[PDB]
Amino acid sequence: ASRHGQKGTIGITYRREDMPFTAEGIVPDLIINPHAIPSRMTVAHLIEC
Amino acid sequence: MIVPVRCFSCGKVVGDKWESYLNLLQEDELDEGTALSRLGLKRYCCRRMILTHVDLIEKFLRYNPL
Amino acid sequence: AKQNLYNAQGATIERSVTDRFTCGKCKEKKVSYYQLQTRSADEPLTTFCTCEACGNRWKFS
Ligand SMILES: [Zn+2]
Ligand SMILES: [Zn+2]
């Protein structure tokens, strides 16, 4: 969970070579779904990021 | 705790750099952002670990076991 | 007598509207709403609906 009440669990795991990746190669640690944003109204999470 | 080995994101070895990053802030009086730059960590996934790791190991170490 | 007749007839709350949705039965845009949340905290408000072209009620999630 975050510091904003976004509790959740791990669905599955991936390695880097099929994790998505950005131009500098910063491969992310973890990906959460966008739909947890609007209905939860958790703006400060985004601001923190 | 020690510095981690091996940044979780990227994989570059970190841990050689720790005491260097310390003495960059002890006598060289240097700003820390430039300290990491001069240490040579230009991606930021690597940069977060040195900048946020806390060293509890010596606070452990000040006991007297055996 | 005029003041008495005015005081006889009572509450007339009037249901402020918008024009975005259409009626579930009449299918016209005179729609009025409300907000509050009913169920537990994990979900948003209820988005109550109240048509005024015919008086219909429905709801959106
Ligand atoms: Zn890294
Ligand atoms: Zn209607």
Q: Residue B46 sits in which domain range?
A: 1-66
- Ligand nearest to the Cα of B5, by number: 1
| Residue C48 host element (H or E) | strand C48-50
Residues, chain C, total? 61
Gap from C38 CA to chain A (nearest CA, Å): 15
Name the residue of chain C whose CA is nearest to A5's CA.
C42
**Domain total for chain B?**
1
Residue C44 CB-density burial (10 A; 0-12 exposed, 13-18 middle, 19+ buried) = middle
Gap from A25 CA to chain C (nearest CA, Å): 36
CA distance A47 to A30: 18
C-alpha torsion B52→A29→A17→A32, nearest 10: -160
Q: Is C54 annotated as contributing to ligand binding?
A: yes
In this structure, what CATH number is given to the domain that contains residue B38? 1.10.10.60
Resolution, given in Å to one decimal, reads 3.7
